[PDB]
Amino acid sequence: VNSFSGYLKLTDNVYIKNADIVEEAKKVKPTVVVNAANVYLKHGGGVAGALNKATNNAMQVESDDYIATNGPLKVGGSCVLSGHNLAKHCLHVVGPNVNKGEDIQLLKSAYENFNQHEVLLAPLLSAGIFGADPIHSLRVCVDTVRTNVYLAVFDKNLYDKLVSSFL
Numbered sequence: 092v093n094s095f096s097g098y099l100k101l102t103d104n105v106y107i108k109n110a111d112i113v114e115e116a117k118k119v120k121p122t123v124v125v126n127a128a129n130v131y132l133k134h135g136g137g138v139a140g141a142l143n144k145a146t147n148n149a150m151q152v153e154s155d156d157y158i159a160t161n162g163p164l165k166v167g168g169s170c171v172l173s174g175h176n177l178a179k180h181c182l183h184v185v186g187p188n189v190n191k192g193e194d195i196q197l198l199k200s201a202y203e204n205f206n207q208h209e210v211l212l213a214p215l216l217s218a219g220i221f222g223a224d225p226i227h228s229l230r231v232c233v234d235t236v237r238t239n240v241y242l243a244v245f246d247k248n249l250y251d252k253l254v255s256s257f258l
């Protein structure tokens with residue numbers, strides 16, 4: 092039993108809600124919140140920009156040190172950093188950005204990172220400003236993640252479409 096509330100159950104392990112991931116994280120304080128990261132951990136907009144803003148830029152400061160030490164992530168890769176005031180940990184996961192011409196096939200690799208964590212709060216990878224089809228992203232998620240994932244979808248109109256179109 093966990094404290095996630097108001098989610099629709101899609102499968103044995105995948106749950107979904109129309110919610111603001113920042114406000115969700117602040118309420119639940121999950122062990123792991125997933126960030127929709129880029130390889131440079133530059134958290135300028137989208138989910139990443141909002142999460143970083145909620146940490147008062149502490150996420151960006153920590154991320155800049157991580158990149159200075161380790162270099163960029165891979166598309167499809169991830170790193171675990173602090174969750175600051177939002178969660179114990181933040182799993183920064185890089186889904187392909189279609190608006191950069193990145194291979195959408197890497198979306199499955201991106202979701203595989205979730206399997207290293209028993210429970211996660213997350214957005215749909217490569218959705219929003221990363222320019223992928225969110226219906227496809229949900230399909231890959233459900234078909235890739237085996238651990239317990241609580242998906243937050245910011246747009247109420249998009250949420251209703253994902254549910255009503257979910258197979």
Ligand SMILES: C[C@H]1CC[C@H](CO)N(c2ncnc3[nH]ccc23)C1
Pocket residue numbers: 110111112113127137138141214215216217218219220225243244245246247249
């Ligand atoms: C991932 C991308 C697509 C699906 C979904 C729609 O709103 N979305 C978000 N969901 C929840 N919280 C959010 N904060 C900032 C953005 C955001 C953004």
Ligand SMILES: [Cl-]
Pocket residue numbers: 136137138218219220221
């Ligand atoms: Cl977005």
